[PDB]
Amino acid sequence: MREIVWVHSQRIAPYKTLILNEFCYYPLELDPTPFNALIFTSKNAVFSLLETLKNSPKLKMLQNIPAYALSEPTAKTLQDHHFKVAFMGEEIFPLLEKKSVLYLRAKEIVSSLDTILLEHGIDFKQAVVYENKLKHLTLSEQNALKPKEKSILIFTAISHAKAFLHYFEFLENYTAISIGNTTALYLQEQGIPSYIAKKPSLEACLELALSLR
């Protein structure tokens, strides 16, 4: 029976998981006074604010400014951590028209929401509050993390595929699984085939992995 390995940001017990990246947090230096809307694309920008600004009056201010999110999970994370979540309807770009928006963002270019905002004529500023960065692993750490031969490897984002290939040979006998086509097409650019989950969820990745074990 083939071993199933997650290459992802969080441990999925009891499955072997390779966590090869780490988040680095940067304090928000900007005065948020000019802004009446915040926008987030990742929960990691929320966690960054919570940590670098814990108990600060700056955090209270930020928790008081109506916050918009692009996905439900990010909205729930904001909601769960005492931010003021804006009314988003029973398509958020219209709600942002005539607003001064602060985008709390990753250092790396992923969705380039900045271009999308600029294209919609939204008055916005961006502040980098986190970076998803490759771990510096010791030799010993690497040997412990090397998958067994014939492993099925689940890649949940490009950053994870990239980090894996930085450290480990992709053996012909491994089978790659991609959460969605952006991951899969990155792997294919690297010469690596993979099967893609039927929906881009962790649950669908495991169904696929188990069908192959």
Automatic annotation (TrEMBL):
Ordered alphabetically, the record's keywords are: Lyase, Porphyrin biosynthesis
GO molecular function terms attached to this record: uroporphyrinogen-III synthase activity
Q: Broadest EC class? A: lyase
What EC number(s) does its UniProt record assign?
A: 4.2.1.75
Q: Name one GO biological process term.
A: uroporphyrinogen III biosynthetic process
Q: Which residues cross the membrane?
A: none
Tell me the domain of life.
Bacteria
Q: Which residues form the Tetrapyrrole biosynthesis uroporphyrinogen III synthase domain?
A: 34-206
Q: Pathway of this protein?
A: Porphyrin-containing compound metabolism; protoporphyrin-IX biosynthesis; coproporphyrinogen-III from 5-aminolevulinate: step 3/4
Which InterPro entries does the entry link to? Answer: 4pyrrol_syn_uPrphyn_synt_sf, 4pyrrol_synth_uPrphyn_synth, UROS/Hem4
Reaction(s) this enzyme catalyzes, per UniProt: hydroxymethylbilane = uroporphyrinogen III + H2O
Q: Which Pfam families match?
A: HEM4
Q: Do the record's keywords include Kinase?
A: no
The family database entries (SUPFAM superfamilies) matched by this protein are listed as:
HemD-like
Q: Which family does it belong to?
A: Belongs to the uroporphyrinogen-III synthase family.
- Role according to the record: Catalyzes cyclization of the linear tetrapyrrole, hydroxymethylbilane, to the macrocyclic uroporphyrinogen III.
NCBIfam families documented for this protein: PRK05928.3-1
Would you tell me the protein name for this molecule?
A: Uroporphyrinogen-III synthase
